[PDB]
Design an enzyme around this catalytic site. Structure first.
Site, PDB file in Angstrom:
ATOM      1  N   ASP A  27       1.244  -1.335   0.198  1.00  0.00           N
ATOM      2  CA  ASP A  27       0.115   0.322  -0.564  1.00  0.00           C
ATOM      3  C   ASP A  27       1.140   1.733   0.416  1.00  0.00           C
ATOM      4  O   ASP A  27       1.858   1.424  -0.447  1.00  0.00           O
ATOM      5  CB  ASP A  27      -1.187  -0.550   1.063  1.00  0.00           C
ATOM      6  CG  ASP A  27      -1.963   0.960   0.765  1.00  0.00           C
ATOM      7  OD1 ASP A  27      -2.193   1.861   1.114  1.00  0.00           O
ATOM      8  OD2 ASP A  27      -3.345   0.579   0.957  1.00  0.00           O
TER       9      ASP A  27
ATOM     10  N   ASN B 107     -14.050  -0.551  -5.485  1.00  0.00           N
ATOM     11  CA  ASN B 107     -15.096  -0.614  -5.101  1.00  0.00           C
ATOM     12  C   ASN B 107     -15.769   0.406  -6.225  1.00  0.00           C
ATOM     13  O   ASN B 107     -16.891   1.874  -6.347  1.00  0.00           O
ATOM     14  CB  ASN B 107     -14.593   1.239  -4.662  1.00  0.00           C
ATOM     15  CG  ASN B 107     -13.784   1.244  -3.209  1.00  0.00           C
ATOM     16  OD1 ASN B 107     -13.583  -0.281  -3.352  1.00  0.00           O
ATOM     17  ND2 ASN B 107     -13.905   1.604  -2.001  1.00  0.00           N
TER      18      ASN B 107
END
Length: 279
Positions: A39, A161
Site C-alpha cells: 500500500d 469500489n
C-alpha cells in the site's frame, strides 16, 4: 479475550448477528504470524502498532505514509485497538505514492518482493499479504498476485469500489487469491462494493474506524477496509493452526456466516468473514 466497545467491523467478525460491540478472540491474536501490507506504507510510530510494524520496502523518495491509507489498513490487521490479529507482525511495502497511486509495474515489483522477503523474516506461523488496491484488468498483475500465493503467502485483495463486476479489475479477478467484498453495519452490501463470481468472502468495510497518519484515527469506507479484516483473520487462524496459507481463504469461506447480507446479486457469494471463536 474480549475488546469492549470495539469497532463495528471487529465485532461483526466474531459475531453471529450484527449490531454488537465486543470483539471476541483467542489471546493468540496472530502472535507468530506476519502480515505484509502492500500500500502507501505504514506509520510504524503509532502507539497503536506497539513497534510491531516496520517498513521493509519502498519505491519512492520516501517510505513514509504521506497518505494515511496504508496506515488505515494496517490498523485493521494488527493494531491493538482496531486490528484482528493484535499480536501479528506487520511489514510495510510502499507501492503506492502519497496520492494513493502507483503504476502496475511497481505493484508487480512489490508482490515479487514479499514472496522472497518472507524468507529473511521470522514467521513460524505463516505469512499473509493484504493488497487493498486495484485497477483495470491486467493479466501480468494477476500472475503477480498468483505468484505471491503459490509461494506460501495468503493473499487477500480488495474486490474494487466501482459497484460493478470484479472480473474486470486486477488483481481482484485472480482466482487463486482471496477477493474480499465490502459490507456495512446493517449487513447490507456496501453501496460501492464490486461484486461477481470472483469474490470469495465479504468483510466489514463501511464506516471503518482505524489508525491514521499523524498519530490519529479516522473512519473511512471501501473494499480497502474489507481486505485487512480477512487478512488479519487469516493470520489469526494460521497462528491457531486451524488453516494454512494455501487453504485459509477456502477455510474462511467454509466457516463464514452463510447468507446474511442484503443486496448480493445472483452469482456473487453471500459469505461474511467470521472467526468461530468459542470462549
Amino acid at each position: 479475550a474480549a475488546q469492549t466497545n470495539a469497532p463495528w467491523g471487529l465485532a461483526r467478525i466474531s459475531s453471529t448477528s450484527p449490531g454488537t460491540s465486543t470483539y471476541y478472540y483467542d489471546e493468540s491474536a496472530g502472535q507468530g504470524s506476519c502480515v505484509y501490507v502492500i500500500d502507501t506504507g505504514i506509520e510504524a510510530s503509532h502507539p497503536e502498532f506497539e513497534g510491531r510494524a516496520q517498513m521493509v520496502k519502498t519505491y519512492y523518495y520516501s517510505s513514509r505514509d504521506g497518505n494515511g491509507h496504508g496506515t488505515h489498513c494496517a490498523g485493521t490487521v494488527g493494531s491493538r485497538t482496531y486490528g484482528v490479529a493484535k499480536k501479528t507482525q506487520l511489514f510495510g511495502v510502499k507501492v503506492l505514492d502519497d496520492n494513493g497511486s502507483g503504476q502496475y509495474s511497481t505493484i508487480i515489483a512489490g508482490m515479487d518482493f514479499v514472496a522472497s522477503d518472507k524468507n529473511n523474516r521470522n514467521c513460524p506461523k505463516g505469512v499473509v499479504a493484504s493488497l487493498s488496491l486495484g485497477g483495470g484488468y491486467s493479466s501480468s498483475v494477476n500472475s503477480a498476485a498468483a505468484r505471491l500465493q503459490s509461494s506460501g503467502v495468503m493473499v487477500a485483495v480488495a474486490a474494487g469500489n466501482n459497484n460493478a463486476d470484479a472480473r474486470n479489475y486486477s488483481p481482484a479477478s485472480e482466482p487463486s487469491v482471496c477477493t474480499v467484498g465490502a459490507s456495512d453495519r446493517y449487513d447490507r452490501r456496501s453501496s460501492f462494493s464490486n461484486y461477481g463470481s470472483v469474490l470469495d468472502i465479504f468483510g466489514p468495510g463501511t464506516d471503518i474506524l482505524s489508525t491514521w497518519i499523524g498519530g490519529s484515527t479516522r473512519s473511512i469506507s471501501g473494499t480497502s477496509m474489507a481486505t485487512p479484516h480477512v487478512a488479519g483473520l487469516a493470520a489469526y487462524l494460521m497462528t491457531l493452526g486451524k488453516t494454512t496459507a494455501a487453504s485459509a481463504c477456502r477455510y474462511i469461506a467454509d466457516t463464514a456466516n452463510k447468507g446474511d447480507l442484503s443486496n448480493i446479486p445472483f452469482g456473487t457469494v453471500n459469505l461474511l468473514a467470521y472467526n468461530n471463536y468459542q470462549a
